[PDB]
């Protein structure tokens, strides 16, 4: 979708090893914020609607 | 503001080489430093990124074990060395900044790129 009518779903309640993005290597402007890329693995938190 | 590249891949044989770019325009442990380059032909490609203050390093998986991102956030400079130098390195490099952890096609700051290239 786009900006203007952008979706909210819930991202809690399943499997998210998020090493399934540090092997990409093809992105361009990977970033986080309150988290280094890292430590959103070991620690991660509820409500992380996407 | 100032992000300048120096150094090139100005090789007659095989061997160690450094690149020596500084960062003399704003701050240097709060932008997260990176380094990335483009090919002759290939586009600009992902090399390595920093942490704000340097706790955090990763590089691509080809140049992880041959590469050493090094930053200084004391006297002003970072270097990136190149190691087990192969043909599959031709670029023109650019050192950068940037708010987040590095890896942005957009930078807050862009380097000038200097030309590496092994040739064997």
């Known amino acids: 979708a786009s900006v203007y009518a952008w979706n909210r779903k819930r991202i809690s309640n399943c499997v998210a090893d998020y090493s399934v993005l540090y092997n990409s290597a093809s992105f361009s402007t990977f970033k986080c914020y309150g988290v280094s890329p890292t430590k959103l693995n070991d620690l991660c938190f509820t409500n992380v609607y996407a | 503001v100032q992000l300048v590249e120096s150094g090139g891949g100005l090789v007659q044989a095989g061997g160690s080489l450094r690149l020596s770019c500084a960062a003399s325009?704003?701050?240097?442990?709060?932008?997260?430093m990176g380094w990335f380059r483009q090919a002759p032909g290939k586009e600009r490609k992902f090399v390595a990124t920093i942490s704000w203050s340097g706790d955090s390093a990763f590089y691509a998986d080809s140049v992880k074990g041959r590469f050493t991102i090094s930053r200084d956030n004391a006297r002003n400079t970072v270097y990136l060395q190149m190691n087990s130098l192969k043909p599959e390195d031709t670029a023109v490099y650019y050192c950068?900044?940037?708010?987040?952890?590095?890896?942005?096609?957009?930078?807050?700051?862009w380097g000038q790129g200097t030309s590496v290239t092994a040739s064997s």
């Open positions: 325009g704003l701050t240097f442990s709060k932008y997260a």
């Open positions: 950068a900044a940037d708010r987040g952890m590095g890896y942005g096609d957009f930078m807050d700051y």
